[PDB]
Amino acid sequence: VTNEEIKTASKIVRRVSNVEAFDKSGSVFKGYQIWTDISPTIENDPNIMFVKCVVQQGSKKEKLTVVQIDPPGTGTPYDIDPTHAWNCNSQVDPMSFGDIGLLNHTNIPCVLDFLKHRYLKNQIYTTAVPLIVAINPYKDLGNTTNEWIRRYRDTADHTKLPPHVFTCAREALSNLHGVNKSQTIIVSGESGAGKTEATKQIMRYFASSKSGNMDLRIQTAIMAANPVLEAFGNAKTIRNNNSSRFGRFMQLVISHEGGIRYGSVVAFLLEKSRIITQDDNERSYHIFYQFLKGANSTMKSKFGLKGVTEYKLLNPNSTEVSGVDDVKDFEEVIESLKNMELSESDIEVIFSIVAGILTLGNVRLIEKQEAGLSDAAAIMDEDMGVFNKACELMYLDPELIKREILIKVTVAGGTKIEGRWNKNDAEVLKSSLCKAMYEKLFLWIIRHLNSRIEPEGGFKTFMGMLDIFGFEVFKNNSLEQLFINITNEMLQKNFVDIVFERESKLYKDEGISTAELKYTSNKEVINVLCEKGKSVLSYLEDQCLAPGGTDEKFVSSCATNLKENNKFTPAKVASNKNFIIQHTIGPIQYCAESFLLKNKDVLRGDLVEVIKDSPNPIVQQLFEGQVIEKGKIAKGSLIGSQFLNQLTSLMNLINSTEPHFIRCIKPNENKKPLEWCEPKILIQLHALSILEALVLRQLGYSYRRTFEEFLYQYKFAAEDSSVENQNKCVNILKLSGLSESMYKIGKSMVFLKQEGAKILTK
């Protein structure tokens, strides 16, 4: 636990309702429990934020006398200001029901406890309508097996099943075949929160068919994609041994009995930087390690493969991951590529290109005295065999690749002015080639799979499945985080809209005015980030296309022009290269250092044309359909421009569907089962809008009983005397002296505000 985590969590903490510890006679109710912010136990443990106390008999109303009961205390009473006392759900078994909304008090210490109780008892799934909250147990609980799938698929009454990832899978599928409306399951959270697993389990649910009377050629290709996608797009980070370094979107056609008929995969924003360099105790993509360890002596000889520690692009110190068998994973990947309908030759080409990327990374560049220059780059003389092997393996012409990396042509005036690149600029070009070849090989493998698994006329009604990171808030947030946080702003509008849509329908069905239902939009912050001409992304594109473009000038243009909006804020410390966006979850600071370097990181020009001129059909296809444009930078070769189009395309699809949300929590930073870090978890409850989903549910007339249920709560039908029961309630609410704003009477139910429902019990 960092001190930044403690500072951040403390800002999330809020007290709303008032603690009612005293009886009508001013005496403390017998063993009345409260949560408190104050305790030595809290100060001494960074994992503890709140403590449970019993308010002592004879306590004063303005200063509470409490004895801390859990964590076990000294027994010594202490005085607290009632502003530091939150209500407690004493007498509630968190194991008996799966919805947080069912609790009487849903404050921060109450929500943390409900989920903690359940987590420690190995109940990791909890509902906070419309959300499914899943907490990483860091162990197999055996609750995602085939018998558990059958249990969730075949059970007649869905209300008899506890919360599970499978509840979204069952609900989404039921609504799809029920009303012929497309559905989307959005799986988000931090890295190591278990999004990967949630997606893998939902897909296995969907693959399980009641009657095996359907062709499974496509389904086997889709299911075989996960080991391949993981091998190429996932990597070991300090936070996760299998971190997904890309955003995944899938469209599926599922039979009502189960079984995947058709599918389409979309990968976006792969971490290109990782192919070239890795931090310490971090690896590059799994495939490099799987291939170098798992490939047979025949392929090892054919591709001239060295060991995992003999490559410049792979960290030598971090080549081993405990619990990860790269050799067995390689067997699984190869088998999966075969199940994706790729021939032994197609596979041999894929691994030739992989070995070629690794080989090219081992080619050393130096700075020679040539063409009247002292800084002309050149390939090291003993590495000329290595460079040729790299080109042979990638099915490229070494002479044309060499010319592209070393020679610099300025085509100004129609006139070709031929120069040379320096060792630094040529190392940039050699590195861009490894990154582009890898990304486009990964994208090709996906394009191949899609040609085999996609429906003929495209999708009409489909099951959408997005896997992305949630809101990212690090010390240093860069371009990558800005993209994830923009994506999350889009999905925030989807969340808010469906919550409102579902509530508004209910009120309309009962004949209650939705005029009081009032929830704000995030149109403003979306605009400050995306809006054509008037946005952060626009000024980024503008500064990338400007010849004298710098990170500082991009921040300055934003500061100047987006001064109009309250959503853009310059940073207090290092104003020149730092900014703040007022996201819905709060202010998120970004560091604009290397924004242009990262936004411009796309292989372009005559290098792309050398790849397209390859005699190999797979290599030809990698850059198939490219802007060409050697000289110089088009918005067709800028990352943010590409991203915003892809995002608009993605959102247009998601916006056409019914959304389902799975919010994944990482409970500790030590990959340990049954360990609970309250600050870490609080930040995530906030960021994943789990706390907002509770605030929203409880807004307006949230207390809804029927006419009869309201009459039973008063001790003294429906189909014989509904207008009698309707009027019996209207008289009760006039007699109790409640304000007309506190209640509304509908076709069959009584609509009470949360505060008005409380006044009725007292």
Residue numbers in the entry: 3 to 718, 723 to 768
Please quote the authors directly.
Like all Apicomplexa (the phylum to which Plasmodium belong), malaria parasites move using a substrate-dependent mechanism called gliding motility, a sophisticated substrate-dependent form of cell movement based on a macromolecular complex called the glideosome. At the glideosome core is the single-headed class XIV myosin A (PfMyoA), and short and oriented filaments of a divergent actin (PfAct1). PfMyoA is a tailless myosin consisting only of a motor domain and light chain binding domain. By solving three structural states of the PfMyoA motor domain, corresponding to three states of the motor cycle, we show how the unique class XIV N-terminal heavy chain extension and its interactions with other structural elements define motor function.
Four molecules are present in the asymmetric unit of crystal type 1, one of the motor domain is in the Rigor-like state and three molecules adopt the Post-rigor (PR) state. Third, the PfMyoA Rigor-like state is stabilized by atypical interactions of WedgeI587 with Switch-2F473, Switch-2V475, SH2-helixH688 and SH2-SH1S691 (red circle in Fig. 4b). We conclude from the structures that the electrostatic interactions with the N-term extension compensate for the absence of a piston-like movement of the SH1-helix, enabling force production by accelerating the transitions of the powerstroke.
